[PDB]
Write an enzyme that holds these catalytic residues in place. Structure first.
Site, short mmCIF file in Angstrom:
data_model
loop_
_atom_site.label_atom_id
_atom_site.label_comp_id
_atom_site.label_asym_id
_atom_site.label_seq_id
_atom_site.Cartn_x
_atom_site.Cartn_y
_atom_site.Cartn_z
N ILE A 11 0.91 -1.55 0.08
CA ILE A 11 0.70 -0.08 0.13
C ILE A 11 1.08 1.27 0.22
O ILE A 11 0.50 1.84 -0.60
CB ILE A 11 -0.86 -0.13 1.10
CG1 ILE A 11 -2.28 -0.81 1.04
CG2 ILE A 11 -0.94 1.63 1.22
CD1 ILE A 11 -3.06 -0.93 2.30
N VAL A 18 5.99 -0.70 6.70
CA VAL A 18 5.46 -0.42 5.47
C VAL A 18 4.26 -0.88 5.38
O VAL A 18 4.25 -1.32 6.69
CB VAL A 18 6.79 -1.09 4.41
CG1 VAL A 18 7.95 -0.79 3.81
CG2 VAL A 18 6.58 -3.13 4.77
N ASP A 128 1.96 13.69 13.27
CA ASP A 128 2.40 14.00 11.95
C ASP A 128 1.36 13.53 10.98
O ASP A 128 1.57 12.77 9.91
CB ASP A 128 3.20 12.54 11.71
CG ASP A 128 4.47 12.51 10.30
OD1 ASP A 128 5.06 11.45 10.35
OD2 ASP A 128 4.69 13.76 10.13
#
Ligand SMILES: O=C(O)c1cc([N+](=O)[O-])ccc1NCCc1c[nH]c2ccccc12
Length: 299
Positions: A11, A18, A128
């Site tokens: 993805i 990951v 973030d």
């Protein structure tokens, strides 16, 4: 049984992991599997970090990705999330020549404020926020994903000696070296994303810490004690910063009406202590006519 699921495709790539689409070979069920490598081959994840992550399985909100399972080994942390097909970055890019329609901008902003109001009320920060971290579906929902919680919780993530970080959404108190984050960092990031949906361009696309700071300063004015009391005492503040004048928000996000510009100005306040809260922003007049349109996604 989390081995009847097989990896279908990659993805994306987070800051420490990951993510794969994983499919159950018998039921068809699909999840997002995030694999985070650790700095150790033997020591695993500290129990206190797993404690803090696992509590989030039972703190649920429609505008936060659902955490389904937490699995840890001697060298890896795996987090299993609900799967959504698309993200706001991809949708922005598909909509870039025309613009996401205003009612959809407003709906997405309202929903993200609802998600942040929830996590902030539970003393959890995202830290973030970026458009690629906001997941969307065909039903008009948008969800906060890819929370920056690994280091906050003590996950011993692998250190990446040459990491390239995107700084574009970073609040100025972080860039000036604040020792303690507040929930206001997420409101700044969301304000940057709001402006990006409206103008079809990132607001502050800096390419280093100082370039990020200087792009903010050239737009909002170099901060001083008048607009940000305490700024001159921040660890990385420099009296030698160039002094740029402030630009009107009518120039920063032009097409946006005065309701939207007023809210954006409160989301991009320099002083985190006076920046609008997510809960207060939900009551802003910009949302008087909020609806829930659906996007046209091409999956
Ligand atoms: O999203 C990630 O990648 C992630 C990474 C780590 N980590 O690496 O320690 C830990 C948690 C993560 N997500 C939690 C999502 C979540 C569900 N319910 C909530 C309620 C409030 C706030 C957040 C949530």
């Amino acid at each position: 049984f989390m081995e009847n699921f097989q990896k279908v495709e990659k993805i994306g790539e987070g800051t420490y992991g990951v993510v794969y689409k994983a499919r159950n070979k018998l039921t068809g069920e699909v999840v997002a599997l995030k694999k985070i490598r650790l700095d150790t081959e033997t020591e695993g994840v500290p129990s206190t970090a797993i404690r803090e992550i696992s509590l989030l399985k039972e703190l649920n909100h429609p505008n936060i990705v659902k955490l389904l399972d937490v699995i840890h080994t001697e060298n890896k942390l795996y987090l299993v999330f609900e799967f959504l097909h698309q993200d706001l970055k991809k949708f922005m890019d598909a909509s870039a020549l025309t613009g996401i329609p205003l009612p959809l901008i407003k709906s997405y902003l309202f929903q993200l404020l609802q998600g942040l109001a929830f996590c902030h009320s539970h003393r959890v920060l995202h830290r973030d926020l970026k458009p690629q971290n906001l997941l969307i579906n065909t039903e008009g929902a948008i969800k906060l994903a890819d929370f920056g919680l690994a280091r906050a919780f003590g996950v011993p993530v692998r250190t990446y000696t040459h990491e390239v970080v995107t700084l574009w959404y970073r609040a100025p108190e972080i860039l000036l070296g604040c020792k303690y984050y507040s929930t206001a960092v997420d409101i700044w990031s969301l304000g940057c994303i709001f402006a990006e949906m409206v103008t079809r361009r990132a607001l502050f696309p800096g390419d280093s810490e100082i370039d990020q700071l200087f792009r903010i300063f050239r737009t909002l004015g170099t901060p001083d004690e008048v607009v940000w009391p305490g700024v001159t005492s921040m660890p990385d503040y420099k009296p030698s910063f160039p002094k740029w004048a402030r630009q009107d928000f009518s120039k920063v996000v032009p097409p946006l009406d005065e309701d939207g510009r007023s809210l954006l100005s409160q989301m991009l306040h320099y002083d985190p202590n006076k920046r609008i809260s997510a809960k207060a922003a939900l009551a802003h007049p910009f949302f008087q006519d909020v609806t829930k349109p659906v996007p046209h996604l091409r999956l």
